[PDB]
């Protein structure tokens, strides 16, 4: 009938009905071809199409209160209609915005899901050149940054048609910090993007080899060719790191962007594909604070941080690790606080996750998520989510991942 | 052919052979029924035995340098013919030795891992009564201990029959502190224990009301009914929790026992269960000072070593609950330390799993592995096990859950 879930802290008990509407043991996989949609160069089977085309079209009339049926009927006779005649739909532009959020609303690995309904969506169908998809990626920057005062918001491009007009940011996020390799060995900035960093230079870029240089955004439209544009300083805001007790925190040059937006999903709905829509949130201080300073195949600050507050480094049992990591955490917080930009600590982005959770499943009895990726990166079990027993279902609409992009891509010159 | 697994920190990448050789999207769920080996009430029937009994037995045999070709088609001989008039076998004391390392090591919840080879091998498959066995587990308690030098060890009760002269230790682990309901409705003690303890005063047990009232050993040997028999105090060594640089810590009056005992699991091997077969290791700083002292539905402590910090415990996003549950993190590991009593912090532990993990793929090519419970409940991605991708399956042999003992028991009077 449904399955019983267990949240071990509160004891409660929920019923997960809606995992019966998924599709089709890999525990901590990051990239399993279960949650990709990669290329394809024919069009989408007509008999594919029109039953994933009418599940959606009655997903959408299906969810107002007071249902107008005529018009539902309606649509969906004009829906076959135009898929008989064209092959592919397009979407209202209702439609569309109910599926963004959907999409957002179905995604397992997202901690920041109640804000789900209270989304910004930019119809950039229209576009048809890198050039104006620069600047409508501008405009979601401008928008969504609005001075500190964080904004969530998704452009949605092009939808994929035959296969070889796809449109795509080969950014992993919007805005993003290059990184070069050096002379002396040492890699300097985000030692993540180094792959990336080089194919902007292959792009013809130029590399102003610091730590927090900006990456070019590298965009491709229609199935064409990639053309890079800078984006412009105007638009970047960034907080600068400043520990509230440590002076010589600042002493550290830190600083980090704030506008997390992922840049390289694709959206599946009613059988459409849509390869770019990049969209954005609000950091949770701990991304910033513990992966992208902390990790080692990040900044790796963990060891300066500590030395500077004067511990054992040299004594792993001291827990100097974990003393350091949570006073960098109390940088990013207290500086995006006091610069007035908008962000959420962990701790309280689980207990709003779990105030999320048991509204969808008194709303739609469950809510897909992936423990893996929900818990915090430091103080798991202290936070609520640790605890709340979870399944993992791919629904629909969605946003999966991509093949690398340049990966795959017949190249023009 | 096998499964590419990379390790997200060190870029390496690994070969999983060894998941082939498992038995038969449920993400973070506690007490699968994919993870438990329930009552039966029939032999093992014969088909079914004698081709895992083989399979095991050319395992055994299979692992020697020096491999004796006589002994082990000999042994194949005499185990089959065993079976044929018997029903079910007999192990060699060196086999179940073999069989008890290996399960551990078959262990996919297991961080201290790395450890395997090393365990002490209790031979109690001569027990007959719940006095006799009593007797076996306070050797073990007391072996175990040695005076805060713990060593890992494992007992082994009579393997299962035909079903219902099942040997089983009612408990979760061999010490472990009381939870009674209180007058004043508050929870006193361990609150996660609340049944399990009023279970001990039905079954006549006197309860001393306190904090750290280490419960009863309640035993059930050959179908019987459970008898129940207090640990002997002079074999349950303690540490008294004293924070090195809070005074007031020892204020907080807390003390936690030093073995980490695992009672009620099922061990499989050859196709023979053993219903009982308590072992333990030695425990890991979190699992005290943050589960045990921190989880609200344990000891709970974190607010209350709050305030004594002196921390805006109103204000979620001071990150008050990080800096706190990490001194008492230190408060633990400083007094097993001072109190001679052996004990390991997490990051050491995951520094020594990783070891083992590549220890386990060159010499069989896989490594059985559950993300979600070996990444420590603090400072996650600051451990390498963190960015460890890695695969989870149920090898043999292995350590089942079982269900609850008094669920499911043919009760005498
Ligand atoms: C409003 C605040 C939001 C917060 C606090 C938030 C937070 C997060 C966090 C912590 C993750 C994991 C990030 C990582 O470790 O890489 C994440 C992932 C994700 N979020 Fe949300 N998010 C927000 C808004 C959004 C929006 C508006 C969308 C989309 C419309 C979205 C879509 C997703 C997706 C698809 C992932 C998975 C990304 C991946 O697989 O790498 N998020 N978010
Ligand atoms: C020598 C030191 C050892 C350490 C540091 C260690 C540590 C751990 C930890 C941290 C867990 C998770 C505990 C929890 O959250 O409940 C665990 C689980 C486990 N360990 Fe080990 N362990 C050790 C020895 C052993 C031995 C000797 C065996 C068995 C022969 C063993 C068998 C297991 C099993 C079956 C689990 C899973 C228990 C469950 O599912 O609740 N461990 N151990
Ligand atoms: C729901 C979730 O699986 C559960 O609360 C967890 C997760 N991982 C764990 N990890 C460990 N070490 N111990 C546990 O009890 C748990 N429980
Ligand atoms: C191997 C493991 O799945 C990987 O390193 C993880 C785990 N969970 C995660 N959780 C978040 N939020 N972000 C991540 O990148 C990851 N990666
Ligand atoms: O907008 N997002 O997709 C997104 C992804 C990751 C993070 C982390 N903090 N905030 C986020 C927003
Ligand atoms: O012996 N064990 O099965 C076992 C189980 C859990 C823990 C936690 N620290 N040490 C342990 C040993």
Known sequence: ????????????????????????????????????????????????????????????????????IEEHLARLEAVTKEIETTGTYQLTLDELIFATKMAWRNAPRCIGRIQWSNLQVFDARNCSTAQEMFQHICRHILYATNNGNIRSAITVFPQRSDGKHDFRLWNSQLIRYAGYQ?????????????????????????????????????????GQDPEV???????????????????????????????PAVANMLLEVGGLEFPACPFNGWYMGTEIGVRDFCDTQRYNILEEVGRRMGLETHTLASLWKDRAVTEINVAVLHSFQKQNVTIMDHHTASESFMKHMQNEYRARGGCPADWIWLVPPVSGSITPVFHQEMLNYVLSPFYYYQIEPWKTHIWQN
Chains 1, 2 share one sequence.
């Open 229 to 259: 544009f800078e984006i412009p300083p105007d638009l970047v805001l960034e907080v600068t790191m400043e520990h509230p007790k440590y002076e010589w925190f600042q002493e550290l040059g830190l600083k980090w962007y704030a506008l």
């Open 182 to 222: 050096m002379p002396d060995g040492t890699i300097r900035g985000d030692a993540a993007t180094l792959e990336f960093t080089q194919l902007c230079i292959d792009l013809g870029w130029k590399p102003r080899y610091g730590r927090f240089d900006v990456l070019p955004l590298v965009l491709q439209a229609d």
């Open 1 to 68: 009938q449904y399955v019983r879930i267990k949240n071990w802290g509160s004891g409660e008990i929920l019923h997960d009905t809606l995992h019966h509407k998924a599709t089709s043991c890999l525990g901590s996989i990051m990239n399993p071809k279960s949650l990709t949609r990669g290329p394809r160069d024919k069009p989408t089977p007509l008999e594919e199409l029109l039953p994933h085309a009418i599940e959606f079209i009655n997903q959408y009339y299906g969810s107002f209160k007071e249902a107008k």
